[PDB]
Amino acid sequence: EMEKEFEQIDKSGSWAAIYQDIRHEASDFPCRVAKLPKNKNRNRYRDVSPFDHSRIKLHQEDNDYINASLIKMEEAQRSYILTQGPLPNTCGHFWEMVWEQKSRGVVMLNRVMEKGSLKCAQYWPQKEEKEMIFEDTNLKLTLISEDIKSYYTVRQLELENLTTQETREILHFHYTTWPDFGVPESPASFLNFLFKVRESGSLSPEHGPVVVHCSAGIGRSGTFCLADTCLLLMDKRKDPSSVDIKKVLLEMRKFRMGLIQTADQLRFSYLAVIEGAKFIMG
Ligand SMILES: O=C(O)C(=O)N(c1ccccc1C(=O)O)c1cccc2ccc(O)cc12
């Protein structure tokens, strides 16, 4: 029982202590390509880089670098591409990846501006009549429709490979209510957001992996992925009480560094899963 474990950590207020153990045990792999001088401007943060073994490679002979990692959960049979919020110069790389990986959905967990500063480039068109064109990767992006709700917004986008004239419908799932500081009050809205993404089929195997991001693509993105897999795992195994979130997180951390950046975030992940399990259980 993780809820029981939850109350023990809260009781003895040892969240920070536990988050730190996870941090210490976490994997550590080379990020050589990410550190190459040529890719300097392709990274938003100096300390957040994709391990070389799990990075996403753009299908171009020039520079195949993009700060994104493929997190493959074998047991859950769920894959996710966690990446940083694109930069002024990597928006075309970002959509090239979505196209190349055959992604159906894009999950954004932050706002373009937070705490008074740019946390992500405006990488999608805000008006139907103002489509965007990324000349470097020869891609056209069009806002087909948008649905703004209290806690999030779903956008229907059309991505066209100008080279082939081929087009695909991309679902933009944007969580707009994540607090500037700390984590959400209750996991409620977050979980609903997750289920909406699920319902879309964006997380399903008949499509490429979903593309998730916030600013660094490790903190909030990690929460989204950790929560989803754990819930899925409790839905698959014979004993849902066997799903160890700390264990799952460490497994994901073999694919990208720093998933879950704070003890608050970790605590929140527990809430999300515990609260999500009460509903998803039936
Ligand atoms: O974009 C992220 O991965 C995010 O999770 N980060 C956070 C880290 C600690 C506390 C809160 C957050 C948050 O945004 O909810 C971040 C991780 C790594 C580097 C970051 C640089 C700037 C920033 O605003 C958030 C970062």
mmCIF file with all atom_site columns, C-alpha atoms and ligand atoms in Angstrom, residues 45 47-48 114-115 119 178-180 182 214-221 261-262 265, ligand 1:
data_model
loop_
_atom_site.group_PDB
_atom_site.id
_atom_site.type_symbol
_atom_site.label_atom_id
_atom_site.label_alt_id
_atom_site.label_comp_id
_atom_site.label_asym_id
_atom_site.label_entity_id
_atom_site.label_seq_id
_atom_site.pdbx_PDB_ins_code
_atom_site.Cartn_x
_atom_site.Cartn_y
_atom_site.Cartn_z
_atom_site.occupancy
_atom_site.B_iso_or_equiv
_atom_site.pdbx_formal_charge
_atom_site.auth_seq_id
_atom_site.auth_comp_id
_atom_site.auth_asym_id
_atom_site.auth_atom_id
_atom_site.pdbx_PDB_model_num
ATOM   1  C CA  . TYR A 1 45  ? 19.730 24.554 -19.748 1.00 0.00 ? 45  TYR A CA  1
ATOM   2  C CA  . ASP A 1 47  ? 22.620 21.105 -16.592 1.00 0.00 ? 47  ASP A CA  1
ATOM   3  C CA  . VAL A 1 48  ? 19.723 19.367 -18.387 1.00 0.00 ? 48  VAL A CA  1
ATOM   4  C CA  . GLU A 1 114 ? 6.140  32.150 -16.134 1.00 0.00 ? 114 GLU A CA  1
ATOM   5  C CA  . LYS A 1 115 ? 7.494  34.269 -13.289 1.00 0.00 ? 115 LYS A CA  1
ATOM   6  C CA  . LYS A 1 119 ? 10.111 29.485 -20.392 1.00 0.00 ? 119 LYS A CA  1
ATOM   7  C CA  . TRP A 1 178 ? 0.271  24.690 -13.219 1.00 0.00 ? 178 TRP A CA  1
ATOM   8  C CA  . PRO A 1 179 ? 1.338  27.102 -10.430 1.00 0.00 ? 179 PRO A CA  1
ATOM   9  C CA  . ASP A 1 180 ? 4.283  29.471 -10.827 1.00 0.00 ? 180 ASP A CA  1
ATOM   10 C CA  . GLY A 1 182 ? 5.368  24.710 -5.974  1.00 0.00 ? 182 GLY A CA  1
ATOM   11 C CA  . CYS A 1 214 ? 7.525  21.905 -19.694 1.00 0.00 ? 214 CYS A CA  1
ATOM   12 C CA  . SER A 1 215 ? 10.628 24.081 -19.599 1.00 0.00 ? 215 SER A CA  1
ATOM   13 C CA  . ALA A 1 216 ? 13.459 21.607 -18.927 1.00 0.00 ? 216 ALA A CA  1
ATOM   14 C CA  . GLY A 1 217 ? 11.291 18.603 -19.686 1.00 0.00 ? 217 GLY A CA  1
ATOM   15 C CA  . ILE A 1 218 ? 12.248 16.719 -16.526 1.00 0.00 ? 218 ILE A CA  1
ATOM   16 C CA  . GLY A 1 219 ? 10.273 18.045 -13.555 1.00 0.00 ? 219 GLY A CA  1
ATOM   17 C CA  . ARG A 1 220 ? 6.635  18.423 -14.577 1.00 0.00 ? 220 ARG A CA  1
ATOM   18 C CA  . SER A 1 221 ? 7.127  16.150 -17.576 1.00 0.00 ? 221 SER A CA  1
ATOM   19 C CA  . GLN A 1 261 ? 13.064 17.923 -9.533  1.00 0.00 ? 261 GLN A CA  1
ATOM   20 C CA  . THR A 1 262 ? 11.758 18.389 -5.971  1.00 0.00 ? 262 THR A CA  1
ATOM   21 C CA  . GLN A 1 265 ? 6.949  17.129 -6.981  1.00 0.00 ? 265 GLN A CA  1
HETATM 22 O O1  . LIG B 2 .   ? 10.953 22.419 -16.640 1.00 0.00 ? 1   LIG B O1  1
HETATM 23 C C1  . LIG B 2 .   ? 11.102 21.636 -15.703 1.00 0.00 ? 1   LIG B C1  1
HETATM 24 O O2  . LIG B 2 .   ? 11.651 20.392 -15.891 1.00 0.00 ? 1   LIG B O2  1
HETATM 25 C C2  . LIG B 2 .   ? 10.728 21.938 -14.224 1.00 0.00 ? 1   LIG B C2  1
HETATM 26 O O3  . LIG B 2 .   ? 10.283 20.896 -13.627 1.00 0.00 ? 1   LIG B O3  1
HETATM 27 N N1  . LIG B 2 .   ? 11.698 22.546 -13.307 1.00 0.00 ? 1   LIG B N1  1
HETATM 28 C C3  . LIG B 2 .   ? 11.334 22.833 -11.893 1.00 0.00 ? 1   LIG B C3  1
HETATM 29 C C4  . LIG B 2 .   ? 12.369 22.551 -10.861 1.00 0.00 ? 1   LIG B C4  1
HETATM 30 C C5  . LIG B 2 .   ? 12.180 22.775 -9.446  1.00 0.00 ? 1   LIG B C5  1
HETATM 31 C C6  . LIG B 2 .   ? 10.934 23.302 -8.959  1.00 0.00 ? 1   LIG B C6  1
HETATM 32 C C7  . LIG B 2 .   ? 9.889  23.602 -9.883  1.00 0.00 ? 1   LIG B C7  1
HETATM 33 C C8  . LIG B 2 .   ? 10.037 23.386 -11.362 1.00 0.00 ? 1   LIG B C8  1
HETATM 34 C C9  . LIG B 2 .   ? 8.820  23.767 -12.166 1.00 0.00 ? 1   LIG B C9  1
HETATM 35 O O4  . LIG B 2 .   ? 8.889  24.393 -13.189 1.00 0.00 ? 1   LIG B O4  1
HETATM 36 O O5  . LIG B 2 .   ? 7.604  23.338 -11.676 1.00 0.00 ? 1   LIG B O5  1
HETATM 37 C C10 . LIG B 2 .   ? 13.019 22.880 -13.802 1.00 0.00 ? 1   LIG B C10 1
HETATM 38 C C11 . LIG B 2 .   ? 14.036 21.848 -13.936 1.00 0.00 ? 1   LIG B C11 1
HETATM 39 C C12 . LIG B 2 .   ? 15.378 22.125 -14.426 1.00 0.00 ? 1   LIG B C12 1
HETATM 40 C C13 . LIG B 2 .   ? 15.755 23.467 -14.803 1.00 0.00 ? 1   LIG B C13 1
HETATM 41 C C14 . LIG B 2 .   ? 14.762 24.537 -14.681 1.00 0.00 ? 1   LIG B C14 1
HETATM 42 C C15 . LIG B 2 .   ? 15.127 25.891 -15.046 1.00 0.00 ? 1   LIG B C15 1
HETATM 43 C C16 . LIG B 2 .   ? 14.152 26.986 -14.934 1.00 0.00 ? 1   LIG B C16 1
HETATM 44 C C17 . LIG B 2 .   ? 12.822 26.715 -14.461 1.00 0.00 ? 1   LIG B C17 1
HETATM 45 O O6  . LIG B 2 .   ? 11.876 27.744 -14.350 1.00 0.00 ? 1   LIG B O6  1
HETATM 46 C C18 . LIG B 2 .   ? 12.459 25.372 -14.095 1.00 0.00 ? 1   LIG B C18 1
HETATM 47 C C19 . LIG B 2 .   ? 13.400 24.254 -14.189 1.00 0.00 ? 1   LIG B C19 1
#
